[PDB]
Each structure stands twice: as C-alpha cells, then as structure tokens.
Amino acid sequence: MIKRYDVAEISKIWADENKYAKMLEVELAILEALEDRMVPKGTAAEIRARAQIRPERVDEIEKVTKHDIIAFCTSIAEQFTAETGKFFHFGVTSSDIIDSALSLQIRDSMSYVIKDLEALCDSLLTKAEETKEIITMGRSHGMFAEPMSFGQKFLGAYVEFKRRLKDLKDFQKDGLTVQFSGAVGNYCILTTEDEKKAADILGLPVEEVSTQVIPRDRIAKLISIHGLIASAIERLAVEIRHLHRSDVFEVYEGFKKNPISTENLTGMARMLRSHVSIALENCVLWHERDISHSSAERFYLPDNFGIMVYALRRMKNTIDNLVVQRDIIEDRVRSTSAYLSSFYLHFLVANTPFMREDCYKIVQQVESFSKKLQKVMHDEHNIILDIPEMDFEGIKKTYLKEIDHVFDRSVKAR
Amino acid sequence: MIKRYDVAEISKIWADENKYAKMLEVELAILEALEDRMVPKGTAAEIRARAQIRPERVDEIEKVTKHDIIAFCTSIAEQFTAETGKFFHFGVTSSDIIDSALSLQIRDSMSYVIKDLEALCDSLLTKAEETKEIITMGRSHGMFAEPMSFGQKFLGAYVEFKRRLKDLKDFQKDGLTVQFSGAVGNYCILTTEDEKKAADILGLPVEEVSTQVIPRDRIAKLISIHGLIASAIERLAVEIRHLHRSDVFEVYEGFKKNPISTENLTGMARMLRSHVSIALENCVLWHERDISHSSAERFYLPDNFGIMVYALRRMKNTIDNLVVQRDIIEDRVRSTSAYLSSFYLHFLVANTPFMREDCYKIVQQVESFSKKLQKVMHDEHNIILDIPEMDFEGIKKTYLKEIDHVFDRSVKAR
Amino acid sequence: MIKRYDVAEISKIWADENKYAKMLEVELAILEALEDRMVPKGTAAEIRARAQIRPERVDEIEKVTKHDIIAFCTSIAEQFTAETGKFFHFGVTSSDIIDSALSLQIRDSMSYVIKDLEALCDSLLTKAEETKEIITMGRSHGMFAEPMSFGQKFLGAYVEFKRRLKDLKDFQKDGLTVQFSGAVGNYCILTTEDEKKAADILGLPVEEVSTQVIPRDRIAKLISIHGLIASAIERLAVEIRHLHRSDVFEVYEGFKKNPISTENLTGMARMLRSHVSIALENCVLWHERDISHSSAERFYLPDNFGIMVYALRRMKNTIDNLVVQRDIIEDRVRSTSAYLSSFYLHFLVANTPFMREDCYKIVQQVAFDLESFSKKLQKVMHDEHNIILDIPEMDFEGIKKTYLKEIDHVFDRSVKARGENLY
Amino acid sequence: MIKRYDVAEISKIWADENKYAKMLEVELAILEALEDRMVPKGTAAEIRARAQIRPERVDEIEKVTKHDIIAFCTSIAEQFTAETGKFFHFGVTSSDIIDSALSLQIRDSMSYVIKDLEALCDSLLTKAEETKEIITMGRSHGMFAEPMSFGQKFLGAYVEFKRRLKDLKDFQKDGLTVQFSGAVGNYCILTTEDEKKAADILGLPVEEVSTQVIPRDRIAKLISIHGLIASAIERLAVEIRHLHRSDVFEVYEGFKKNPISTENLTGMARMLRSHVSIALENCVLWHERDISHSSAERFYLPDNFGIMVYALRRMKNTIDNLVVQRDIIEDRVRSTSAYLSSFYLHFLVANTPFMREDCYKIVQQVAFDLESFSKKLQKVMHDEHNIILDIPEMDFEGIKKTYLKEIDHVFDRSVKARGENLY
Numbered sequence A, B: 001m002i003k004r005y006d007v008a009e010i011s012k013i014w015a016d017e018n019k020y021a022k023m024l025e026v027e028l029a030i031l032e033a034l035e036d037r038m039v040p041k042g043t044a045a046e047i048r049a050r051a052q053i054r055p056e057r058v059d060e061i062e063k064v065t066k067h068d069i070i071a072f073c074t075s076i077a078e079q080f081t082a083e084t085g086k087f088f089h090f091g092v093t094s095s096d097i098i099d100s101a102l103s104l105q106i107r108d109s110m111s112y113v114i115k116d117l118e119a120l121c122d123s124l125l126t127k128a129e130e131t132k133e134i135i136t137m138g139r140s141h142g143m144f145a146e147p148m149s150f151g152q153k154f155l156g157a158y159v160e161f162k163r164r165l166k167d168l169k170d171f172q173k174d175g176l177t178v179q180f181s182g183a184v185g186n187y188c189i190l191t192t193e194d195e196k197k198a199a200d201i202l203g204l205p206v207e208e209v210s211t212q213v214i215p216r217d218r219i220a221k222l223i224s225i226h227g228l229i230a231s232a233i234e235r236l237a238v239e240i241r242h243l244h245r246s247d248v249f250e251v252y253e254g255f256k257k258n259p260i261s262t263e264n265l266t267g268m269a270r271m272l273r274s275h276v277s278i279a280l281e282n283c284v285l286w287h288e289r290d291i292s293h294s295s296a297e298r299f300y301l302p303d304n305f306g307i308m309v310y311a312l313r314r315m316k317n318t319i320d321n322l323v324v325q326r327d328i329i330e331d332r333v334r335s336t337s338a339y340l341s342s343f344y345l346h347f348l349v350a351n352t353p354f355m356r357e358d359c360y361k362i363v364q365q366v367e368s369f370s371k372k373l374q375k376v377m378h379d380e381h382n383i384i385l386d387i388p389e390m391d392f393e394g395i396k397k398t399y400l401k402e403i404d405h406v407f408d409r410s411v412k413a414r
Numbered sequence C, D: 001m002i003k004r005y006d007v008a009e010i011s012k013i014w015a016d017e018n019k020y021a022k023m024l025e026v027e028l029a030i031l032e033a034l035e036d037r038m039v040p041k042g043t044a045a046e047i048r049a050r051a052q053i054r055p056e057r058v059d060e061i062e063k064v065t066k067h068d069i070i071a072f073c074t075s076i077a078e079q080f081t082a083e084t085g086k087f088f089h090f091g092v093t094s095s096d097i098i099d100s101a102l103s104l105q106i107r108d109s110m111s112y113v114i115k116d117l118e119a120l121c122d123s124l125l126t127k128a129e130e131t132k133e134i135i136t137m138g139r140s141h142g143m144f145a146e147p148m149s150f151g152q153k154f155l156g157a158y159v160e161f162k163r164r165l166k167d168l169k170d171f172q173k174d175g176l177t178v179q180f181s182g183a184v185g186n187y188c189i190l191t192t193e194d195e196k197k198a199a200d201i202l203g204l205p206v207e208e209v210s211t212q213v214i215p216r217d218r219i220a221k222l223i224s225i226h227g228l229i230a231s232a233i234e235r236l237a238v239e240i241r242h243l244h245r246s247d248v249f250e251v252y253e254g255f256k257k258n259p260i261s262t263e264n265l266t267g268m269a270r271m272l273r274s275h276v277s278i279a280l281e282n283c284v285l286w287h288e289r290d291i292s293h294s295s296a297e298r299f300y301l302p303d304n305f306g307i308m309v310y311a312l313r314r315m316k317n318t319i320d321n322l323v324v325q326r327d328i329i330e331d332r333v334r335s336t337s338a339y340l341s342s343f344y345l346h347f348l349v350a351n352t353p354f355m356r357e358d359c360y361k362i363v364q365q366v367a368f369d370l371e372s373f374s375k376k377l378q379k380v381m382h383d384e385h386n387i388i389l390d391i392p393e394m395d396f397e398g399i400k401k402t403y404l405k406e407i408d409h410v411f412d413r414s415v416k417a418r419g420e421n422l423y
C-alpha cells in the first residue's frame, strides 16, 4: 500500500498494532475456555484488563527468537507474574492463533467492503432511474445498432454489482472460521470442547478439518469474489471512458475534462485481478502446512482490501458526480435512421403474408418513412394497415417499450 | 482438447453438431412462444420434427456469409417452404440464440462435473474411513511435528471438495440464464412476455439486464469455482506425490512405482487455473457487446469442462487404487520420540503448580519416559500423579483422541 | 486447437505423426554417434531408410505398456531383426528423446512465427508510409489533444513488433538445446562426446546442465516473448476498434461494417497471455524431474503456436485490407481549434519578454474576441504592446507544417536503412 | 511494500523525494538543451544549484491542482523569480517528464538487482564446487533413479540464474529510453535535436516512436524477465525444501531446524510472478495514452524491485549458510543397489552377442541368487557362456567412478572461463 491511496481505517486493520491486538483476543478466547479445565477462573479477564500491545518490543524480541509469534507471546508474558502468565498460549500451535486472528481482520475488512459495495449499488440505481427515459444509441462492436434506454447502462452495472454483493453476503454468513486444534489438527492438549467454547467467544464457526493451519481455499474463495468485482469495476470504468471520449462526449466526470477517475479505477481493477493467482497458489501447502503463503499474504491481503475499499468509494463518487449530457445523447439518436429498415421489415413480415426478401425489397425500395411505406401497400399491393409513426416520440415508445419491466425485475423493491 | 485426454461425452457436448442442435432448440423455444402472437400454431413443432443439423453445410454457407449464425439459420431455413420458415429467427439478435444455447451446453457439462465431483468425495471419505486408525507423523515445513490420524489427510481433502461441491450446486440452482431481448436488450420486436415463455420452455431463468449478450461474469464465476477446484486437486496430488517418494514411501499408486497419475493431475490443475484470467478478462466487453470473448470461449470452455471431468475421474480412480503401506507409516511414528518432550512439559504445567522452565528443565533433564519422570517428582519434588504411559498404544490414544469428533463434524451423515 | 482456427502446417508439426518422426530422428542421431563406439557402422542409416512411423500401432502398444516411449520404441524395433534393433534407445533416458525432439518441433514452429511476424512488420510499415502524410487528432484519455501524423499510429505498432521480432531472432540463435545425458543428467552409459556428436547431427547446442529433462525455463522464456507479442497484438487491435467505431469512423475493415477481425484477435491475445503462467509454473519441477509439465505442454504448446501463427496472419491481412478514410480523419482536425492556444501561448512566451500568466490572458483575449488567429494576435502585440513578431499563419497548411514538422526524423530513426543513401 | 521486508536503499529510490529529484533532473536536461534555442545560457545550471525537493509542499499544492506534475512544477517555480522559472517545463508534456524520470528510477533499481543476482550466481557456484565430489541419489518422480553429483544440483541452478543474468545485462544495454516529444509524440514545440541533446545529458537513448507516453512493453519485458527469475528462485527453494524434510534430511538451513527461509522465498516468487500479468495488461493503452497504468505502477513497481532485491539477498545468504550433510547423502547411495541392474544390462548388451531379453534374465539371475555383483556375473558369463569379460567392480568407489565420470566436463562447459588455462 502507498500513501496516495491509503484508506486509514483499512490500513489500521492490517497494521501491526491491530494484528497483535487480534492475536491477543484469540489467545484470551482459548485461555478463557481453558478456565473450564486447568486455568484459574478470572485469568483471561485479568490479562485482558492490563495487556499492552508493543510492536517495537515485539520486533526487538523477534531479532533474537527469529519467530514472530514467540516474540509476541514473550511481549505479553513479560507484563505479568510468572503465575498469571503460566497458561498463556497453552496447548495451541502458533497458527491456531495466527489464522484465527487473521479471520478477525478479514471479517472486519469485509464489513467495510460490503458497506461500500452497497453504497455503490445505490448510486448506480439512482443514476439508472435518473437517465431511464433518455434514449441513446446502443452499440455493438462499437457500431450503432438500435436505440435503447441510457439508464439501462447503469442498471446493467447495478445488477452485476448486486450479484457480487450477494456473493459477499453469502461468504459473510458462511465463509470464515477459526481453529484451536494444536500442532497438526490432532488435539494433543486441547479438546474439541475447548475449541468450540473459544470459537463461540470469538463469534465464528470451527474449521471442520484444520491442520496446523486453516486451509487457504477459504481466502482464495473470497479473493476470487473480489476478482469478479474487479471485472465489474473495469467494465463500468471502460463504459464511462468510452462515453467520455471527445468523439462521443455523452458524459463527463464532474469537477480539462478527462476520465481520469475511471482510468485510475481501471488500474486498481488490474491490481485486484492479479491477486487471484496468488491466493490460488497459496492453497497448495505441503502436508500439515508450509509457511510460504505467509509472506505473500502479508503483501497482498492488506493491499487487496485497501484497494477494494478505495476503488468502490471512488467509483461511487464518480457515478454520483458524473454529468450526463442529455441533448448530445438524444441528438445522436435523431441523427441516425438506419436501424429503422429492420423495424419496418419486421413490421411487414409480422402484419402481412409476404416473405422477407419481398418485405425487404419494398422497404429497400423506399418525409415520413411510415407514410410512404403505408401508401405503397395500399396503392400497389392493396394491403391496408396502421403503420406507427417513427418520429422521435414514436421511436422512444418503440425502443423503450419494456424498460419498466426491465427495471422491475432488476430491483427487489419494484 | 487432444485425443489423449478426450472424454467422449464431454467433447460431444461442445462439438459443432451439438452446438447447432442447442441453437436450434433455443430458436424453436422463442418460435413456439411467438405462436401466442403472429406465428401460426404448430410451426415450431413442424420444424422440430424435420430439421437436420448439417455442420459441413453450415461451414460452406459461412464461407459466403462470413457470419456463423446467419449460416446456421440459412442451413435450417433451406429445408422448409418459404412459408414454414418465415418466422424462424424472428425478432431475436444472433447472440440471443448463441448465449442461450451456450447456457444449455454449460448446464449439460456441469451435470457431469457435479456427478464426478460427488464420486470423488465419496472415494475420499471411503479412504479416510479406511485409514482413520492408522497413526502417522504429521509434518510442518516437511519436518516431523506430532503424530496424527493418517485418515485425516483424506478427510481434509474430502471436506474441501465438499465445499466446492456446494459452490457448484449453488451455481446449478442459481447461475445460468437465457435471453430473448433483441439487438441491444431493448425489445424492439420481442416482448418480455415472449422472452419469459421461451425461457420457461428451456427451463432456465431470464437475464435481469441483458445487452446484445448475456453478461460474462456468470461464466467467470463458474470458471472461478473450477479454479478453486484445481487448487484442491493440486493440493491432493502434491500430498500423494510427497508420500509416494522413495524417502517416505508411505503410499504407492496402484497398478516401476511412480506417482505418474498425480503428476499428470498437477499439470491438469495448472491448465484449469490458467482459464480464470481469460474468463475475468472476457467480462470487460465494450458497450452493448464486443465479440472478443467468442474466439477465446471457443478454445477454453470445451477444454475447461473436458479437463475437469477427466481430472476428477482420474483422481477418483487413483484414490481408489492407492496402496497405503500401514507398517511403514506406523513404524515411522515408532522411530521418532522427540514430540514427547512437549507432551510431558504440558502435562506437568497442567497437573503441577510449577512453571514452564521448571517443568521444562525437568523433562529436559530426563525405558519408560513416563515412569522415570513420575519417579522423579515423587522422589525429589514430592509430588504424586498418574502419568500416562506413552508406549505406542498410549501414543495412539493421545494423538487420535478427537478423531471421531473430527469425522463426525466433517460428514453430514455422522 | 479447433478446426475453425487450425492452420494446417502448424497442427501437422504437433500431430502424432511428426511427433514420432522427430523422436525417430533424435534416436538415430545418438545411435549414429554411438557407432563410434559399440554400434556397428551403418546401423543408424539402415533404420533411417526403412523405419515407418505408425501412430496407430503406437497407440495399441501404449494400451499395454502405459508408457508412450516404450510403445514408440517397440513400434520401431518390431520392424527390424533383433540384431539390427539391438542398440536402439541405448543409454538414453526417455526424456533425452522426448525433450530433444520437442526442441525440433519448437524450432520448426518458430520458423513460421518469425516469417509471419516479420511479414506483419512489413505490412504495418507499408501502412505507415502510405498514411504518413495524413493529419489526424492525437488523443489522450480519449480526449482531443494535438494533431499528429496518422501514419505514426502504424509506425508505433511497427517498432513494437520489431522489438519482438528481434527478441525471437535472438532466441532462434540461442534458446533451444538438446540433451543426451541419461537418467538424471549423469552420463552412466553415454559420454559427453557422444552427446556432442549427436547434437551436431541435429544442429542444436547441448544443454549446459540437464537433468532427466531439459530445464523448462527455455520454453518459459519463449512463451514470455509470445506473451509480449500478445500485448502488441491487443494494443493494435484496440486502436483499430476505437477508430472503427461509429462515432469516430476513421477506418473500416475491408472486405456490415464492423471490426470483427480485430475483436477476434483480441480474443486470441487473451489466450496467448494465459499460457505465460502455465509455462512459468512448469519450471518448478521436483529434483531431477517430474512429469507434471507434460500433460500441460500437450495442450498449450500446439495451441500457442497455432494461435500465434493464425493471429499474425489474420492481423497482417486485416492491416493490408484496412480502409483509411482520409477526409473524415482530416476534417476532424479542421473541426477542432482548441490546441492552438497552447501553440500561441508558447509562441508568446518564447518570443516576448512577457511572462506566462500575461501571455495567457492575451491569447485568451484574441481567442474569445475573434478570421486569422495569427494575424489578429500579431496585431494586438504591436498595437497593444509595440512588439514586432512574425507569427506563422495557422491555417490548415500551417497546422500541418507545425504538427508534422519532425515526422521525417521519426520514420528515419524507426526504420534501420530508411534515410540511408543506398545507391 | 511492508517494513518487514523493506530494503532501505530500494524503497528510497521509489520514495517521493527521489521520484521528484529524478523529475527535476529530467526537467533540467530538456531545459539545458533548450538553451541552444530560446532559453538564456546558464538557466538550467542556476536552478540545478538551488532548487529544493519538498514532497510535503507538493502534496499541499496537489490538493488544489488535482494534478501531481503541476504541483511539482509549482513547487520548483515558486523558489525562483518569474524570469528564472519562465522556461521551466516548456514544450514538454507531463509524461515526457514522468516517464523519462521513471526510466532513471528503474535504471538505478536494476543496478541493485543485477549486483545481487550475480552475487547469488557466485554463491551457487561456490556451493557447487564445494559439493561437486559428493555422490547423491538422483530422483525422478521423487523416486530413486541413479547416483549423480550433489554439486550438479547447485550447478543447475547456477546456469539458470546465469541465463537470467544475461537477459538482464542485455536489457541494461538496451531496454530503457527517454522521451521529449510533447503532447502526443508530435514535436509541436520541441525538436528531435532538443530531445536528443537532453537524452544525451541523461545518458539514455531516445524512444523510437513515443506517444504522450513511452510504450509500456519495455517495462513489461523487464517484468517478464523478473517473472522467469521468480521461477528460478522457486525451483531452487523447492529443491532445498525437499532435501530439508525429516524423511530426507540431506541439508538444513544454517543459523528448530526448518526450511523457513526457502518457504519465505517461495512466497516471494508467487508475488513476483503475479506482477507479470499487470505489466502485460498495462501495455494496452488507448490511442496516444491513457493513465490507467499509473496507479498500477505506483503499487507494483516498487514492490517488484523491493521483493526482487530482498529475495536475491536472502537466497544468497541461505545458500552460503546451508549445511550439507555429506554422510547422510552418501549413505543413502550406499543403501540402494537397484540402479545397478540397468548398468549390468547395458554392459552385457554392449559386450556380448546376446540380445536384451537374454541379458536381462542373466542379470535378474545373479541379482536374486546373490558379495560382489560384478565378479559373480563375470563368473557366470565365462562359466555359463564361455565369454571373457573385464567387468569393473561396482563397489562404492567404482559406483562413484561410473556415475560421476563426466562431472568435470559438465562443470567446464557450464562456467565460461573454468577449464581454460589462464596463467
């Protein structure tokens, strides 16, 4: 992480002080559970009330121990009598503490992500509603195809971020775990009863099969969801960048006029996407555990959450402040009439007994397009029918016909 | 895909003949829905009863049209009277047909994957139960740590594949969609009523916001799940490869003895993992669609399903036929006594009022380890306690104490 | 690989028949070398003249053996007397044969990639020279900036593809190797002299340190170059797709009008890029070798070369056939005058004692008040400030003179022999 | 980057203070060039002697401007008279400065990577020479195969890291460039002569075709090389982790005994490998540029260089301090005799008129019946078949003679001057 994009409350979660604070919370959870066995009652409460987190001291100890968790434990134990600290870190392996505390950091980080993802959805739906009745040229291969609702662009992103929001809420309900299973998930000293009591104190479920570590596919699953979110961010950023260009000029980022925010967000999306492979590779641990995932996690996890929160907040503000240039958007529809050939062709195919090439050759052969067309049938083919006017109001009625249904099905409230 | 690893029923799903057959099914679904409007009743049934799939003819037409869907439509229409074929491919855009048919191919492919993933879980649980009472050395950093249940290695993989199985079943219940929304999801000719009727015929839900295409994050989500499955396969393959090596020799692949199957599966896992980025990048389509995803999907999707099914079946057979060398596994536990220091140290800490270094210095200072230890306390410290025998039977009782609970919580039936 | 994109001569190289033909050539290279020792003179030549490649037969034998090289060797040996086939596959490990033959397949595949990459370079420069004279609006963040030469767009792709062409030609000179080192690179039966003779017959250098296998970082290096080419393909494809859109419409793909080819090629680029991680992971083999890389290579290597050749040829044809719409391009330059303020600002800064903030209001003054921008500004300068200036006329011709001033130099430094006198 | 792995001299290069100091050097290079035109002689030297780098001040200004280069320029200009600062940042576009200065940061970072990569090569060869004499079991699929030199494990890593060192030194000679081409590479105000003079002051070549930006494939090429190095780091780390495990125990990391360092470095390799895709994607910029690559580069470039330098130094120290357990290694060779059958099979094939299938039963006969394998087989050959052979004794010393026969040649061809007479 760098200062330019640092969200303070997110970096605080991953800072050494909170890292040790969460490990301490996990230590005291199992210590309190063990008060039902050999630990004197009140011990955990006593340590909780006094224990200080001292990262510089931990660092100093680690220079000698060459082991960060031993250094952490030493930094806590040296604040209490030998008697009070006796059962601190008893029966657990270091990673029981590390991985359980890690879940706490992830849990707290997810809370911010989810809040900011909801906020972004709300902004997109607001924008979609605001522009729902603006008619614009839909484009395929970058080429004009048919008119459509401009608002449907924002609604399309809205429903995609909503899909991701459901994924995250599903993971929040069921995703994270803790473990107090000892050296290799074998419960030499601890019991599954101790572990369950500690887990209940922390408010998370127990890993079904832990080893020395919690299996890394849980993290990988979350990071995968974040990868899909990165694609949603990038697709929306790219849409805005396209509409922003001088040639199109249908929107501009609110504040010489450049899409610098959505370009920035494209870069953020690339970063988030690059973490997916790391998380997948960190799963392939040797036997009951290898520590290779540790150094990688120290880099990418704080960055992943920090970039994710930064990006969702920046995208929300960009959407809120985006200027939509209605007249430019709609004049472009006015300026193009090519799509109408297919409309009339279909209309004839549907309302007359003639075939494609026949209906085609007529429309092709052919001031109101509708009028002269309807005149031709009566005059030559002696067929009479009420061909709808295609003037701009008729074009809107035609190409925005189902927009209310599309919004209804996309939004839970409607 | 190559012949060496080709699973026939999977490649058949993605072969041109089934590709066109599914597009035909989708065409007839919307055609039948339109019989509630302008299409004569019985039209879809009439075409269904006669239409032939002719891939060589499609290819021949595409040389002229330069458009595969137009070529496909032409190959169907030229089999019927101009009257019967009149409303074939009416109101839809090409990708309404393509993407909806694609969902059908994915759906049918997923059915095989899910069946083979369930089979692999069953095999792993069977293997875990068979080896549950075999004691082995747990290893951290590749180094002996503490004894544990050998079966817990297979149970660990079992629960991970089970997590993936839930993910896939969740996607199967809710993941795939169809669309009949026209050129840019704007319903110029079709109605949402037509689309819903067609979707009901196909048995899939309607995309909330489609453009010209179905948004590619649905595919990306599935491919992401397959990526996590690849990590599960690789972690299990690596475990087997480790236990298979000449130095350890705790298992061998059933049939000079080499872990060639799990090595093969490691390569398959790499392939599956490489597809994740493709699927994520295919999401970032321009405006209402760009066709760039198409060529990539033509390569990686048939390969992804083909490799996935091949790999899950090969892993199942390898697990079933794996030879577990019990005496080698257990003699290794017998051959090591280092882990016991921590046991006794903890035992003393827990059952006496002495402190770590004191309990440490004793165990360190110290034929039954238990006996002489228990003798020392009575003789010198005048403390009396029933120190459990650590002989091999006692070691098993100690380090497999919670194994029944671990299996119980991991398996729904127990 | 699929039929839709299959380039016949590339898939043929990776087809079972050529795979075994290259294995045979490698087996006969070491066998001929060994004729300097224990093998009767003429043995390799005898087998070379008669042996048939029978992929079908290899398959049925492989059903029994569970080992493809044993199956291949048996398919050869069974065509000869027990005596003649005696020293076939002697001293080598299976992967001495597999990996050395794989180098031959990669070598022949590279020949096609290099020919097609150079041809794409040629077509890009042809397009650059053809359009060097055309003035277009340069764009940053998609927003109009300053006019530039349209040909510089193609020349920018040219130089990038030439950087890749040099990388490939460098690898061609020094990248591929062979090995005849035995089970774990230890030469139990074979000697380094045998290995060297056999390598000389094949025309490739000997791997410095081999194991059972040739190390996979050589393949990974080549695939990494192909990954960089994929970025070049994508950058150029995206440029064409941008220029092809209805809003800009400065080019169209030749032969309703869509950039379907450059979209296809964007897909191809994603595929090529996906292989890089596979190649890098395939490097991490256990000890003296483990066969995990094999299944992976059977999928991605023929696809990588097949897609690369397909994409380079299709992109070249797309560039050749691209229609450049000059009047649309240059009219867009005419329709925009905003960039001129920076020109005039710099002009006043460089030619008056005034300071930037002053010069900026003056230019902002004339611009909103006011028709020749130059002559009017020139008027005020003398009139308001008594300053004598020769401000060049910024009409279309002057604008072209200004913003394409150095285009000759850029072309000359970008193309090696261009700008040298040759005759 | 995090404090735990932060190498001070590398993070300093990427710290705001040096970022702006390099921007200043680039600004003054073009300013000095422009003294041959409109800028009064001495101006660049005046600013060079006095200008202070004030990252703090840049930040407060950037709060207003929303533009980091305007903020930087303003931080410099406000230290001087309006006159002296008049031609500061004249004619250039912001990215002429940013990208040229970025090349200077990359150049200085490369110097450290190259020094540390060569030092790791040195340490690996030192380990290879020290252990060249030790006989170990080679392993394929993790299964015992044939004995080999233990030193060849380290030599195999050596040659791979040397392949990467050559790639980096090649890029160092020809990889980085600078640009002074203006808004879209079009030279509205600047000339190619100005650009060339400024580039000569900086000591880097001019980009052949620049846009607003220098094309990102140069960065991607370097990052791709770093990705290949990451595979080399991982392959070596995994080898040590395998040999360190309790079951094998042939080495341990020097200073309870764990391969914690090589596990850490495996993590570092995964990180380096993750950056390759970022670099490749950053190539695909829209038209004459789009700033999406910027935020990405601010994260991954300092991390890439920081991790690379950290990993190369830590791996070197780990190799230097690695304890090789010779008696364990060689006793394992003594404990295995299976490989000898292939030796004897080949011996009989090469030295008798008998055919393979016959020779195989003979070797299988002596092996199960029977103590010197050689002399006993030699007995049967004369006794059973009346054949006269000098079968070498396959005791420990003979086994060493056989399976390390060519080790001198492998070392000599792997190390350039090794095996040349020098004095």
Ligand SMILES: Nc1ncnc2c1ncn2[C@@H]1O[C@H](COP(=O)(O)O)[C@@H](O)[C@H]1O
Pocket (backbone or CB within 6 Å): A066, A067, A068, A069, A094, A095, A212, A291, A294, A295, A298, B140, D004, D258, D260, D263, D264
């Ligand atoms: N089994 C283990 N569980 C937890 N931490 C460990 C274990 N073994 C070593 N460590 C320490 O964990 C830290 C990992 O450092 P890093 O690789 O920088 O994340 C080192 O300080 C190791 O000493």
Ligand SMILES: Nc1ncnc2c1ncn2[C@@H]1O[C@H](COP(=O)(O)O)[C@@H](O)[C@H]1O
Pocket (backbone or CB within 6 Å): A140, B066, B067, B068, B069, B094, B095, B212, B291, B294, B295, B298, C004, C258, C260, C263, C264
């Ligand atoms: N809007 C569109 N929807 C569906 N298919 C299209 C569209 N435009 C072109 N195609 C055709 O789809 C095919 C894509 O080919 P490929 O890129 O090889 O998958 C080409 O034959 C195109 O002619």
Ligand SMILES: Nc1ncnc2c1ncn2[C@@H]1O[C@H](COP(=O)(O)O)[C@@H](O)[C@H]1O
Pocket (backbone or CB within 6 Å): B004, B258, B260, B263, B264, C066, C067, C068, C069, C094, C095, C212, C291, C294, C295, D140
């Ligand atoms: N050490 C070895 N060198 C070369 N090939 C081998 C070796 N061991 C086994 N094989 C065979 O190589 C083939 C690899 O199959 P696959 O994993 O599908 O590429 C299998 O048929 C194996 O029997």
Ligand SMILES: Nc1ncnc2c1ncn2[C@@H]1O[C@H](COP(=O)(O)O)[C@@H](O)[C@H]1O
Pocket (backbone or CB within 6 Å): A004, A258, A260, A263, A264, C140, D066, D067, D068, D069, D094, D095, D212, D291, D294, D295
């Ligand atoms: N054409 C340009 N060249 C260089 N920098 C720019 C350009 N346009 C905007 N910027 C600034 O560069 C910075 C990029 O921010 P970031 O995306 O965080 O790297 C922003 O402060 C922009 O104001």
Ligand SMILES: [Cl-]
Pocket (backbone or CB within 6 Å): C407, C408, C409, C411, C412
């Ligand atoms: Cl010229």
Ligand SMILES: [Cl-]
Pocket (backbone or CB within 6 Å): C125, C129, C415, C418
């Ligand atoms: Cl030329």
Ligand SMILES: [Cl-]
Pocket (backbone or CB within 6 Å): D407, D408, D409, D411, D412
């Ligand atoms: Cl030597």
Ligand SMILES: [Cl-]
Pocket (backbone or CB within 6 Å): D125, D129, D415, D418
């Ligand atoms: Cl040397």
Ligand SMILES: [K+]
Pocket (backbone or CB within 6 Å): A246, A247, A248, C247, C248
């Ligand atoms: K336009």
Ligand SMILES: [K+]
Pocket (backbone or CB within 6 Å): A408, A409, A410, A411, A412, A413, A414
């Ligand atoms: K709803």
Ligand SMILES: [K+]
Pocket (backbone or CB within 6 Å): B246, B247, B248, D247, D248
């Ligand atoms: K062993």
Ligand SMILES: [K+]
Pocket (backbone or CB within 6 Å): B408, B409, B410, B411, B412, B413, B414
């Ligand atoms: K249960």
Ligand SMILES: [K+]
Pocket (backbone or CB within 6 Å): C411, C412, C413, C414, C415, C416, C417, C418, C419, C420
């Ligand atoms: K030249």
Ligand SMILES: [K+]
Pocket (backbone or CB within 6 Å): D411, D412, D413, D414, D415, D416, D417, D418, D419, D420
């Ligand atoms: K040498």
